[PDB]
Amino acid sequence: MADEQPKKPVPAAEEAPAAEAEAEEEEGLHLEDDQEPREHPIMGGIYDAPLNNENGFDKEDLARFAVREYNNKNNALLEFVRVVKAKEQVVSGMMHYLTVEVNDAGKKKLYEAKVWEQVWMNFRQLQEFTYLGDA
16 A cells, blocks of 8 residues: 555644634534544554444544544634545554545545544544545
8 A cells, every 4th residue: 555654653632623603514414512523443454444334424523523623723624525435544542544525615625534543542633634636
């Protein structure tokens, strides 16, 4: 595989957004109590990732979570439409590399997002967010 960031350190998280409303929004599933909770991914190399919770709710929560996670820190304010790729990774816990389609003022494209979550540390956040061409 290309091996982008399968083995490397991670930045420092902070929190999620809340203020500054948006304009439009995709149409898929409705969240609960706002925010976008995470899921419990399983081990696996850069390929193994059937995503049992691919019903839409889980994938949406993660996709929006990662996007908003890197979009709230400072990046622009875009909106994801849905996930197009899913991969699993093991590093000091459980890392999930999933790619989703994002839109911004009409600009549609496909961006990859890698989230990390441990079990002994009880922590989860976004590591990196790459912007690809289009799905």
